[PDB]
């Protein structure tokens with residue numbers, strides 16, 4: 220079987236993408252953030268403390284005939300940006316774009332951090348990293364992808380994120396009409412539980428391609444592109460008036476500047492990120508300083524190929540016994 224669901228940016232800057240997901244019987248539809256950088260499916264629920272809920276749609280397990288409390292199970296997760304959430308665990312039926320999994324662990328948030336509360340468009344997260352990162356104790360739980368794997372025609376899902384436009388998450392098949400040319404596959408390391416791979420180099424604008432190995436993760440749940448300091452300095456040096464700002468927390472540039480493209484390597488292939496994708500608009504309303512979409516990973520400890528990079532490509536997450544990542548121009 221297969222599934223296909225439209226994903227939509229939550230705002231005008233593509234800060235995140237939400238995808239409708241059906242949970243329970245009868246269906247309760249929540250808009251979840253599909254995150255290949257984590258492995259927990261957690262949702263706002265009727266159990267979330269009332270003051271930490273501001274406009275989100277909430278999962279009510281008491282209204283679902285298929286919901287079962289997973290007795291004794293708890294979860295606690297903390298994301299690389301400082302966000303956190305925790306609660307108890309139910310099992311229920313979960314459907315994405317026609318693809319249905321029964322008995323999926325649905326982690327009910329009893330407490331959520333302030334950043335989730337103030338984001339009324341995101342009802343929860345659907346983790347798509349490897350199940351070894353799942354935070355349910357004492358019995359670790361499988362992701363939606365892992366539970367669906369056997370029934371999928373092919374053990375793959377694809378991310379086709381749009382630039383200021385809706386996109387598509389497909390499960391079980393590769394849409395050969397969604398990309399141009401060939402798909403270039405590259406090996407994945409699952410040692411840290413991420414979709415971790417090695418880029419073969421980069422280029423700035425129309426400059427020479429620098430062959431160098433960049434280890435990083437493919438993370439749909441991260442907005443920006445986080446690369447080593449040497450690469451990020453070489454990019455922003457080509458933008459008149461750009462500078463790293465300690466008060467803002469990254470590179471900013473005059474909103475009047477035009478940005479060069481950024482090319483990253485996938486084996487022998489090249490993926491070009493148009494310069495417009497790197498503009499994240501004024502740092503504050505009315506400001507003439509704009510925030511850059513390529514930032515340093517030095518403070519993070521791992522390089523992150525976030526939405527800025529992934530939306531420039533058709534990306535195949537191949538969850539075969541030997542996992543691989545496929546990249547294609549589109």
Ligand SMILES: NCc1ccc(C(F)(F)F)cc1
Nearest residue numbers: 256257298299438440441521
């Ligand atoms: N989007 C999930 C996510 C967030 C942060 C990290 C970090 F910071 F640990 F790299 C990995 C994955």
